[PDB]
């Protein structure tokens, strides 16, 4: 049983976003469409459920306030509308089908991030973290690249257009205030650097940004 869900929904605080889940798998199984929230990294909160084949709706009484459930049963579509949004609400939102005695959600949709920020597509500043005097671990010279200030996610940071893979460590993008930040390191033999180009290589494709930045001495 398969479930269809919405795009990522970037919005600014005070928004009434709407997501839909139209299932096409569970027809005649007089089942429920479930909605669950997944916080940043792990935590889960139940929002509620709706029966397409009936119109039975119930909510966790604490989401009973920010969400509402709708179903255009014909269209197989049931919608959740998250009104009044604040920064917190930036999370994955999951759809899920349940049938019979189990009282377990066996078919979960694919999810959709509802990222909130009061900023429009700011392209990124990209800076060279040449080992400005960490000096040496003999072998290890670790260089870095600082992508800071973009919005929204994602970026594609290669190092030397794809043939520099081994020793790379890119860290997940976290949001400074409304804007993202990201950095990677690349760790090397004492003879590739400085002698050969280690260019950090950032494309922030949502804002047509492509930037190669050489990490020289």
């Amino acid at each position: 049983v398969q479930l269809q869900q919405s795009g990522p929904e970037l919005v600014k605080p005070g928004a009434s976003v709407r997501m839909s889940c139209k299932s096409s798998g569970y027809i005649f199984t007089d089942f429920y469409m479930n909605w669950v929230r997944q916080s940043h990294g792990k935590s889960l909160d139940y929002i509620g459920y709706i029966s397409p084949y009936s119109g039975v709706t119930g909510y966790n009484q604490k989401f009973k306030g920010k969400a509402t459930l709708t179903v255009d049963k014909s269209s197989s579509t049931a919608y959740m509308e998250l009104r009044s949004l604040t920064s917190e609400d930036s999370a994955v939102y999951y759809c899920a089908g349940s049938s019979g005695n189990k009282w377990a959600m066996d078919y979960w949709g694919h999810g959709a991030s509802v990222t909130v920020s009061s900023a429009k597509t700011t392209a990124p500043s990209v800076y060279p973290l040449a080992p400005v005097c960490g000096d040496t671990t003999g072998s290890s010279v670790t260089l870095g690249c600082l992508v800071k200030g973009y919005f929204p996610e994602p970026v594609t940071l290669t190092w030397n257009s794809g043939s520099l893979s081994s020793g790379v460590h890119t860290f997940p993008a976290v949001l400074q205030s409304d804007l993202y930040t990201l950095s990677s390191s690349v760790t090397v033999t004492s003879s590739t650097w400085p002698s050969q180009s280690i260019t950090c290589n950032v494309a922030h494709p949502a804002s047509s940004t492509k930037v190669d930045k050489k990490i020289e001495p």
């Binding site: 139940y46 189990k102 800076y127 973290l129 670790t142 460590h169 930040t181």
Partner: protein
């Protein structure tokens, strides 16, 4: 709200051990119609949850024989017989007995290995940035084990929090380590206002802190 409590947070295993996970309730999940509604979910990284076991011992159609659950009333367990690689993920318990449905915190199974001390690196601000009015100092702390570290920044001996940004690797499928970045974002004038910048990693590998500094 019936509070669920899964322990431990991180269960570190090696491949093919047994994995044992506990789930406790703030009261009986036995329903007034004899059924107990305790559910278990796996969420592998980058994917959604999936139904492993509903009603404490029933494998959902398709779950293998190595996952079987047990328990009653308030205390429940999942035992994985031989932890294959495709069993790594977050295991969450849920109770459907009372309204609202509630889930327990989650349990991450990470692969074990020895320790590894963090290879720290401290990075002065880039010239390009100083022209734009900013100064951010980055510490890179690579290839360590376990995932437990303390990083304190100390701008001229005195420590600093206001304005730190931190991010994390999960386990590397090469050498099962963790890595971290800590970016202290200052302003060009705070940077010019001060001289030595310290970055310190406290972790089981040194009793004495791992330190990394520079002066501008």
């Amino acid at each position: 709200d019936v509070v669920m409590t899964q322990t431990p947070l991180s269960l570190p295993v090696s491949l093919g051990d047994q994995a044992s996970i506990s789930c406790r309730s703030s009261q009986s999940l036995v329903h007034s119609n004899g059924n107990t509604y305790l559910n278990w979910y796996l969420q592998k990284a980058g994917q959604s949850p999936k139904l492993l076991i509903y009603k404490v011992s029933n494998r959902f159609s398709g779950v293998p024989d190595r996952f079987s659950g047990s328990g009653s009333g308030t205390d429940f367990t999942l035992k994985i017989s031989r932890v294959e690689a495709e069993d790594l993920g977050i295991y969450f318990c849920s109770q459907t007995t009372h309204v609202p449905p509630t889930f327990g915190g989650g349990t991450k199974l990470e692969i074990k290995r020895a320790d590894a001390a963090p290879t720290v690196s401290i990075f002065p601000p880039s010239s390009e940035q100083l022209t734009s009015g900013g100064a951010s100092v980055v510490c890179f702390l690579n290839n360590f084990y376990p995932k437990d570290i303390n990083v304190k920044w100390k701008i001229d001996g005195s420590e600093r929090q206001n304005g730190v940004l931190n991010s994390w690797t999960d386990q590397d499928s090469k050498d099962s380590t963790y890595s971290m970045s800590s970016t202290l974002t200052l302003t060009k004038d705070e940077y010019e206002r001060h001289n030595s910048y310290t970055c310190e990693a406290t972790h089981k590998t040194s009793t004495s802190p791992i330190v990394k500094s520079f002066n501008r």
